[PDB]
Design a protein around this ligand. Structure first.
Ligand SMILES: *[C@@H]1O[C@H](CO)[C@@H](O[C@@H]2O[C@H](CO)[C@@H](O)[C@H](O)[C@H]2NC(C)=O)[C@H](O)[C@H]1NC(C)=O
Ligand SMILES: *[C@@H]1O[C@H](CO)[C@@H](O[C@@H]2O[C@H](CO)[C@@H](O)[C@H](O)[C@H]2NC(C)=O)[C@H](O)[C@H]1NC(C)=O
Ligand SMILES: *[C@@H]1O[C@H](CO)[C@@H](O)[C@H](O)[C@H]1NC(C)=O
Lengths: 99, 43, 99, 28, 120
């Protein structure tokens, strides 16, 4: 390929991105962007696919270094560990009642 | 997935398993995806 | 790499900042057949293969599913229903030396 | 060259089945 | 008698791809090559590309490296394959070709209406 060759004959580098999806756990993934943290307000949360609604407050329960969220005698979620700051948040239901 | 749980403990006893209770925290998960039917230790 | 022996690179168990290249806007020919690039940074795949090869300005359009060529006949051919992206930088400047 | 030996695993090999926190409770 | 015509244009992003369609139904017998110029409000027509009867290609200094002027193998439809258009390339493009004289199939010329190209 000449240094001053014409465009119809110039060299051109090329890369092909070929995709593989076998029968196995997936390995190459797209990045997931995170919103910001809000406390003390009835909000709509999603911690690593764990989704729900309620009021997030701070707590004093102490997980074990490998645990992700708590549960209750009725097997309902009530606490969660934030993926980044590594704190323990309590979840309380959004107020409701009769009139 | 291939999952490995483990635990360490100190003992002073010979030639037999101690009678005790202790749980095993998870240690690693590796997403290989290979059929396994046999294994062997190395020492 | 050389056109005769194109170079294949394996990518697995990481995250593809595809936006870091979708935000380049200084490129010669980038077309992904099989998936719209809008969600390219928002997917999960088992494996990625980067095949690097060198073509001519006229040979740039040769390497495609269904389009033939001398290098396409000899160096490599794409499959009938390839699912992947083709990227080509048609720069004579650095791909070829003086003389 | 010896014959195989056996012994008795009294109560061993209990692992946290998953990554959930529970307190003062009896799970099944 | 319109022997050069331009179409297929529109608006493209920066970093996006486009394709241009210029029709020269009498370009083969001329043996005097096809061009691409572009005019801007307040600017004189400056060449975008130039493809001769042999297939050697020249381009506007702002477009070379990405603009690729090419002829169809059959039914010559000289396209201009580009990617990552820049907001400056927006203009009234055109094709220019010389057409037969009494004895010359060349420099006696005719211009094309042009393709309006908008890069936003
Ligand atoms: C996740 O990344 C954030 C961003 O840096 C980390 O937050 C900082 O961690 C450093 C560690 O020394 C502290 O000094 C800063 O005060 C933290 N906050 C900032 C920089 O705003 C966080 O620790 C990381 N967590 C994990 C689990 O990787
Ligand atoms: C590797 O390549 C990338 C992609 O070009 C470089 O990142 C920038 O990409 C833009 C895209 O047009 C160029 O205009 C810039 O000149 C590139 N460089 C910078 C510093 O912005 C990246 O720099 C390259 N790195 C190496 C080590 O080659
Ligand atoms: C694993 O076994 C399953 C069925 O037992 C079979 O379909 C699969 O091909 C096997 N894979 C390997 C890698 O042995």
């Amino acid at each position: 390929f000449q240094p001053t060759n014409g465009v119809g004959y110039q060299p051109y580098r090329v890369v092909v991105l070929s995709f593989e999806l076998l029968h196995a756990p997936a390995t190459v993934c797209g990045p997931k962007k995170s919103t910001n943290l809000v406390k003390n307000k009835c909000v709509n949360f999603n911690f690593n696919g764990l989704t729900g609604t309620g009021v997030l407050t701070e707590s004093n329960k102490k997980f074990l270094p490998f645990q992700q969220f708590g549960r209750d005698i009725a097997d309902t979620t009530d606490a969660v560990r934030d993926p980044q700051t590594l704190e323990i948040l309590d979840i309380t239901p959004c107020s409701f009642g009769g009139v | 997935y291939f999952k490995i749980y483990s635990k360490h403990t100190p003992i002073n006893l010979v030639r037999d398993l101690p009678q005790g209770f202790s749980a095993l925290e998870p240690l690693v998960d590796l997403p290989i995806g290979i059929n396994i039917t046999r294994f062997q230790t190395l020492l | 790499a050389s056109v005769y022996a194109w170079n294949r690179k394996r990518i697995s168990n990481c995250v593809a900042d595809y936006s870091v290249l979708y935000n380049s806007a200084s490129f010669s020919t980038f077309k992904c057949y099989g998936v719209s690039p809008t969600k390219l940074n928002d997917l999960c795949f088992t494996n990625v293969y980067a095949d690097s090869f060198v073509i001519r300005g006229d040979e740039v359009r040769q390497i495609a599913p269904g389009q033939t060529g001398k290098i396409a006949d000899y160096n490599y051919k794409l499959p009938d229903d390839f699912t992947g992206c083709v990227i080509a930088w048609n720069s004579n400047n650095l791909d070829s030396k003086v003389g | 060259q010896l014959p195989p030996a056996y012994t008795n695993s009294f109560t061993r090999g209990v692992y946290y089945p998953d990554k959930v926190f529970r307190s003062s409770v009896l799970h099944s | 008698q319109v022997k050069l015509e331009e179409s297929g244009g529109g608006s493209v992003q920066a970093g996006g791809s486009l394709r241009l369609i210029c029709t020269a139904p009498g370009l083969t017998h001329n043996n005097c090559g096809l061009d691409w110029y572009r005019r801007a409000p307040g600017k004189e027509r400056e060449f975008v590309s130039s493809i001769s009867a042999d297939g050697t290609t020249s381009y506007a200094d702002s477009v070379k490296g990405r603009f690729t002027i090419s002829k169809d193998k059959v039914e010559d439809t000289v396209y201009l394959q580009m990617n990552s258009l820049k907001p400056e390339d927006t203009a009234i493009y055109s094709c220019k070709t010389a057409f037969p004289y009494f004895g010359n199939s060349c420099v006696l010329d005719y211009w094309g209406q042009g393709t309006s190209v908008t890069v936003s």
